[PDB]
Design a protein around this ligand. Structure first.
Ligand SMILES: *[C@@H]1O[C@H](CO)[C@@H](O)[C@H](O)[C@H]1NC(C)=O
Ligand SMILES: [Ca+2]
Length: 496
């Protein structure tokens, strides 16, 4: 459960938030495969409630109606097509599995679903699964409202409804088997793993029971005995009775403290500085690296909908965001996931964005296709951060330095730091309000290297900054606090 099952050489997965299946299949072939991306995290592929008020928000996909592969992203045929094509090119598919609950208990009964499936939240009836009143733990929850009211009570956090979402009785073998049937269907199709949504709201033992019913990966693409990659979404920022370490026996866990602390450091909040990142990782109280799933921002907290708060960096803070993602992709801690979003009309009323529910670019509810501009950027409101040179090149940087130790660390006691990865890579950062000009030890072999942040290595030449490393591995770095990208990265494969 702990290995991503990516092709040797690929070290990151990208979350193509709300992308259609056909667009992902194309992206796998035309860009993800050639640029060295290990895999893609897709949005929930199972039927969800169609919410028209507000108009088709992104969170409607976290309110299941059934397990049919029928969503705004496409149907089962298109989904299968995408997994085959992506797998055939070495790019794995990870599914966002919403198995802790069904839709909101207050949702209207009828056929307002993405596949026309009938459902009645009031009577706990979901015939398309099928599920009934006996499959929910309305009788198990002990709160007066039936919802979770106190996170200091680990019991209600797991047995009560998260903001009204009908809670499934995961202790029942019937329910465990219905969820496993859904996941095994996806595994046999070709998926390599799953992101377990709201894992904090499920008992570690109930999850284990379910994972015990799952098949090994499809032997047509994976070696015999391959187990699905599992990363549990547990928001543990400390202070609660529930700990993310309680889920270690099931697989990896999302480390939400990672993006939160990186944000406050890069933003220089509370007097924090980049020089403190010297012992970044377990030294900061994070979970063990071999159990961590890290990211800068996620679909939730990028719109103030998740843990992290106001410190979280997103594409909106382009300059600082590129620097944070760059540090993450260069540092050895955990397995990295890159975010890929879409633009929405942010509208801060009282320090709050009242348009944080807005769903993906669409035409009367129909998701817009991802169009590629001549410069490789995306159109139709898709941000495509994974296509930004600075990020795309750092993804490759991680692949090239995979396995190399953390060394040659340098810092000015402020916000000017640098470090290398064995003898395969070196990165320098300038987050101070002044210029950086100094000769540093890179531990790299002598030669001329192309800076992969400002440019690219094309045709035996660099399109951006060039760095000259001497015989003793020393090289001079000059970064003005006025540079578009205040950091420089060079590696073995960017050498001339
Ligand atoms: C580097 O580019 C210049 C032209 O811009 C040329 O002198 C040289 O041949 C190029 N080297 C290669 C290998 O193309
Ligand atoms: Ca629960």
């Amino acid at each position: 459960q702990y290995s991503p099952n990516t092709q040797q050489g690929r070290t990151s997965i990208v979350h193509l938030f709300e992308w259609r299946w056909v667009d992902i299949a194309l992206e796998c072939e035309r860009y993800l495969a050639p640029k060295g991306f290990g895999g893609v995290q897709v949005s929930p592929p199972n039927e969800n409630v169609a919410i028209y008020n507000p108009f088709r928000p992104w969170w409607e996909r976290y309110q299941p109606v059934s397990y049919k592969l029928c969503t705004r992203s496409g149907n089962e045929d298109e989904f299968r097509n995408m997994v085959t094509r992506c797998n055939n090119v070495g790019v794995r598919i990870y599914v966002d599995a919403v198995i802790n609950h069904m839709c909101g208990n207050a949702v209207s009964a009828g056929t307002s679903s993405t596949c026309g499936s009938y459902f009645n939240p009031g009577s706990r009836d979901f015939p398309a699964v099928p599920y009934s009143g006996w499959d929910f733990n309305d009788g198990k929850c002990k709160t007066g409202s039936g919802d979770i009211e106190n996170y200091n009570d680990a019991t209600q956090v797991r047995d009560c409804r998260l903001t009204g979402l009908l809670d499934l009785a995961l202790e029942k073998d019937y329910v465990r088997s219905k969820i496993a049937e859904y996941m095994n269907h996806l595994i046999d199709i070709g998926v390599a793993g799953f992101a377990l949504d709201a894992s904090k709201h499920m008992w570690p033992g109930d999850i284990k029971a379910i994972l015990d019913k799952l098949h090994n990966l499809n032997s047509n693409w994976f070696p015999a005995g391959s187990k699905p990659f599992i990363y549990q979404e547990v928001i543990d920022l400390g202070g609660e009775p529930i700990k993310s370490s309680d889920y270690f026996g099931n697989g990896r866990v999302t480390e939400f403290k990672y993006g939160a602390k990186l944000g406050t450091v890069i933003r220089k909040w509370n007097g924090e500085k980049m020089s403190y990142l010297k012992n970044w990782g377990e030294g900061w109280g994070f979970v063990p690296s071999d159990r961590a799933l890290v990211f800068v921002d996620n679909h939730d907290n990028q719109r103030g909908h998740g843990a992290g708060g106001a410190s979280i960096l997103t594409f909106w803070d382009a300059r600082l965001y590129k620097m944070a993602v760059g540090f993450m992709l260069a540092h050895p801690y955990g397995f990295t996931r890159v975010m890929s979003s879409y633009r929405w009309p942010r509208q801060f009323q009282n320090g709050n964005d009242v348009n944080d529910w807005v769903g993906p670019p669409n035409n009367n509810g129909v998701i817009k296709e991802v169009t590629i501009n001549p410069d490789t950027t995306c159109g139709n409101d898709w941000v495509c951060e994974h296509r930004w040179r600075q990020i795309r090149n750092m993804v490759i940087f991680r692949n090239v330095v995979d396995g190399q130790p953390f060394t040659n660390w340098y810092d000015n006691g402020s916000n000017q730091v640098a470090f290398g990865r064995g003898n395969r890579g070196f990165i320098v950062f300038n987050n101070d309000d002044w210029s950086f000009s100094l000769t540093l030890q890179t531990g790299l072999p002598a030669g001329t290297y192309c800076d992969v942040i400002s440019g690219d290595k094309i045709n035996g030449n660099c399109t951006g900054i060039k760095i000259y490393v001497s015989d003793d591995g020393k090289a001079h770095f000059s970064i003005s606090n006025s540079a578009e990208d205040p950091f420089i990265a060079i590696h073995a494969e960017s050498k001339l």
